[PDB]
Amino acid sequence: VFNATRFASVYAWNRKASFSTFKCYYADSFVIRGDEVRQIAPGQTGKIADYNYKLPDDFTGCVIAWNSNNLDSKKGGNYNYLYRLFRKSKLKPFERDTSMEIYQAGNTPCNGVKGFNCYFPLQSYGFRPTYGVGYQPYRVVVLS
Amino acid sequence: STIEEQAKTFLDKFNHEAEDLFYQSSLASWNYNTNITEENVQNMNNAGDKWSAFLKEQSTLAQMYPLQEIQNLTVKLQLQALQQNGSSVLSEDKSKRLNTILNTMSTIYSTGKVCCLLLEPGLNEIMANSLDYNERLWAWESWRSEVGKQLRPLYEEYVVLKNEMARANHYEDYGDYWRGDYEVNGVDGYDYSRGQLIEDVEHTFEEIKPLYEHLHAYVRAKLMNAYPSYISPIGCLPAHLLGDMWGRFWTNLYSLTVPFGQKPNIDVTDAMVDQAWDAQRIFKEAEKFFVSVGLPNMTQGFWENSMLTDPGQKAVCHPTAWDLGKGDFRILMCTKVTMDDFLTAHHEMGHIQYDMAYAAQPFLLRNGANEGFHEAVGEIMSLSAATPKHLKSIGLLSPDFQEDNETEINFLLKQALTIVGTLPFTYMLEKWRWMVFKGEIPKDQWMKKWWEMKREIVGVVEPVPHDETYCDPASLFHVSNDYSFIRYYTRTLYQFQFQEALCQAAKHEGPLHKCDISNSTEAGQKLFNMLRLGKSEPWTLALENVVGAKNMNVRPLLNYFEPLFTWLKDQNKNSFVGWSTDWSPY
Ligand SMILES: *[C@@H]1O[C@H](CO)[C@@H](O)[C@H](O)[C@H]1NC(C)=O
Ligand SMILES: *[C@@H]1O[C@H](CO)[C@@H](O)[C@H](O)[C@H]1NC(C)=O
Ligand SMILES: *[C@@H]1O[C@H](CO)[C@@H](O)[C@H](O)[C@H]1NC(C)=O
Ligand SMILES: [Zn+2]
Secondary structure, X not given: OOOOOOOOOOXXXXXOOOOOEEEEOOEEEEEEOHHHHHHOOOOOOOOHHHXXXXXXXXXXXXXXXXXXXXXXXXXXXXXEEEEEOOOOOOOOXXXXXXXXXXXXXXXXXXXXXXXXXXXXXXXXXXXXXXOOOOOOOEXXXXXX | OOHHHHHHHHHHHHHHHHHHHHHHHHHHHHHHHHOOOOOHHHHHHHHHHHHHHHHHHHHHHHOOOOHHHOOOHHHHHHHHHHOOOOHHHOOOHHHHHHHHHHHHHHHHHHOOEEOOEEHHXXXXXXXXXXXXXXXXXXXXXXXXXXXXXXXXXXXXHHHHHHHHHHHOOOOOOHHHHHHHHHOEOOOOOOOEOOOOHHHHHHHHHHHHHHHHHHHHHHHHHHHHHHOHHHOOOOOOEEHHHOOOOOOOOOHHHHHHOOOOOOOOOOOOHHHHHOOOOOHHHHHHHHHHHHHHOOOOOOOHHHHHHOEOOOOOOOOOOOOEEEEOOOOOEEEEOOOOOOOOHHHHHHHHHHHHHHHHHOOOOOHHHOOOOOOOOHHHHHHHHHHHHOOHHXXXXXXXXXXXXXXXXXXXXXXXXXXXXXXXXXXXXHHHXXXXXXXXXXXXXXXXXXXXXHHHHHHHHHOEEOOOOOOOOOOHHHHOHHHHOOOOOOHHHHHHHHHHHHHHHHHHHXXXXXXXXXXXXXXXXXXXXXXXXXXXXXXXXXHHHHHHHHOOOOOOOOHHHHHHOHHHHHHHHHHHHHOOOOOOOOOOOO
16 A cells, blocks of 8 residues: 555554655555665664564565655654564564563563563654654555 | 673663653754743753753663673773763752852852943953053953952862762862863773873973963063053063953954054955855855865755844854754854854854764764864864965955965964963963862962962963952853863864874875865865764774874974964064063062
């Protein structure tokens, strides 16, 4: 869906002109940051390609991405878009993780509550129109 | 799981939260500055309080990772940056007392008046413009006897509280705390302690002394012409006659001490107000200059969200470069059509280029290598942009202009008055403060020693005797507003080290005072290799990348002023060079 009015989050990606990026090598849809679009490619590494959305090394589809600063940002902040920061291990190609469990980073466990060395694993982009071009929203659609 | 991995995880959480909180705080502050109202002074305080509370909590819970269990030296730098206590080590009564003392000392300064003139612009126009001995002496002694006499005992208590605050942080006094900005540990070959900065400063001043002797004697002869029955040809210079309230710069003396007065200096104000230049042409020219040496353009937000003209609503028109984070760079400056705003633009855009360089380092590693790098990087651009070759290459000077050997001495002498005439002042003031923090000057001798180190290091004498109810040093903005003062010395040396290295990479033949680094990419790769590091490396390594050595040096500063030194040596052939600490005007 190239024209829906509301896109998903990158950790909860969906499945069913002015294209800043059209790189060819189902239709997944999400929203990420500007300078993270480079990570939607085979053999990449980061937070997005580790904990949020991974692509295999032998891929056949395409990748489309385009700016969205006039729709997905507002004066004050748009805290409705999220991404996963912590995970126990990297993903697998096309896997998906919608869990919201506390991440334990030490040796004593969490009681399911935050505190010393226990972090809530999801973090939001607070999108604004007066951001740099690398910190502005970007809508991404991946084919096949 | 080792205590290092947990530190890395804690830090990559901290960075992500602090970026957002800091952006919204600084946006509030900008919105206030560009449009002063009543609703905005509150929206500033809201976000300021939020950011400060966040920082306090994160430092408190960062103190639980002991540094001895960390082998990576970047994690160590950031954890050190976060594990610092501050006035949190004192009590609650002592913290509140220190804040009350600081606020009282600031407001006594900023609203002081004598009889009905305030310091700005009342008593500053009598010090920069008047030509009367008696009126200048009146303004000087009035400012000394109204404000400082009120700041003596507050300062006496300030010293005690600051010393014990710093001793509870495992330093030895507050001067040591201050010198702790130039310390490096753990690196093999690039180490530096807090007791070696004193040695370096005192080792370089011994070589700056002769040029200052000759300039002091020249200025003394000219002032002896202007104030005939008041100056002695072998003594010091009276303190109230240097075109300044304190004597920090000797600039306003130019009109009295110009070498060849029948040759006017360069001023392209008419050549630009006559071609219809405006406020945007200046910044387009500065952008062209910085692109010529291979640095990037400006961003679109810079052109959309910068205030580059006075909009008739109030505002604070002080020139400033803003780095809000998240790709947001701005400038606040109400510029005119003049030859000094043309240079301030280059200064501020040098600040912005340095900011844009290290925007990839983690949140806490985004500054200069130490406290004297931003200003040097800004100043070398104004050095290289004011060159008659540059002003002729942009069409702002006629090709029928020919440089004159008598006009290159007026320029060098003005530069000397501004730049060299301020170094003994800085060295002496910070030496007095260090010795008072250390405990080597008792209370009952403070003013006895101030006016003993003015007659020896600076060569300046006081017109009337000052007993021990006075606090003359605290009558300066930096001393009663709790700021350090040694960054100016080190910055003034670094700027000439930088400029010599860059103009040597640009294959310049001739005197150093004529060099222009425009159209040189090899001079723009050497600067960027230091700008990109932020403060992720010891300042000695970042200094060695550009220069070739790893410490301060005074030889390029003396290479800049060599023709002036030869001229002055010939001018003072039948004079006395050096002063005697015995003659006093009373
Ligand atoms: C200046 O501030 C006032 C309220 O503080 C606001 O109404 C006005 O629009 C502001 N000016 C501009 C140009 O936005
Ligand atoms: C230190 O940690 C950083 C990541 O925080 C890593 O990139 C770097 O290689 C580490 N250095 C050493 C010497 O292990
Ligand atoms: C830089 O090079 C351009 C292109 O040749 C020239 O127009 C300009 O005058 C040069 N500027 C300086 C300062 O040499
Ligand atoms: Zn500056």
